[PDB]
């Protein structure tokens, strides 16, 4: 797949991603906060089409992500991220995609998520998060 790396910012304003109910997660793109002003991150598109778009718009800065969780699984012989759920201090967004395979979850007790990096081919291959105070 095609690797990407957004880098670190000062916060998160909007997350936009797409999924498919039979396969996994496709496109991924995020609007970050850069010192009090919006910042449009590059858009990480999938190599194929057919996904459903989802827009998650946080009420920044009073609302922020407090737990990220999902499922990773085997699709067409490849290991990919199959589901994704974002829970904040106000509401939960998810799950999106198939909830099947091996689950992972990252609850934050103190700190913030300020950046993302990963890789997408047909589906999102893997990803990592940037943490901070």
């Amino acid at each position: 797949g095609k690797a990407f790396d957004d880098g670190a910012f000062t916060g998160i304003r909007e997350i936009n991603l797409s999924y498919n109910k039979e396969t996994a997660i496709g496109d991924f793109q995020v609007v970050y906060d850069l010192n009090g002003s919006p910042y449009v991150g590059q858009n990480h598109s999938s190599f194929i089409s057919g996904f459903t778009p989802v827009k998650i718009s946080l009420d920044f800065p009073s609302e922020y992500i407090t737990e990220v969780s999902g499922y990773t699984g085997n699709v067409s012989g490849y290991v990919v991220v199959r589901s994704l759920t974002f829970k904040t201090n106000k509401k939960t967004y998810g799950p999106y995609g198939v909830t099947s395979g091996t689950p992972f979850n990252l609850p934050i007790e103190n700190g913030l998520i300020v950046g993302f990096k990963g890789s997408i081919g047909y589906w999102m291959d893997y990803f990592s998060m940037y943490l901070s105070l």
Binding site: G1, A8, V81, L106, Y126, F127, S128, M129, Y130, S132
Partner: peptide
């Protein structure tokens, strides 16, 4: 060396 750094967790999904 002149670039700031931050902690990073993952990846989750395919290896390497």
């Amino acid at each position: 060396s002149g670039k700031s750094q931050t902690v990073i967790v993952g990846p989750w999904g395919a290896k390497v």
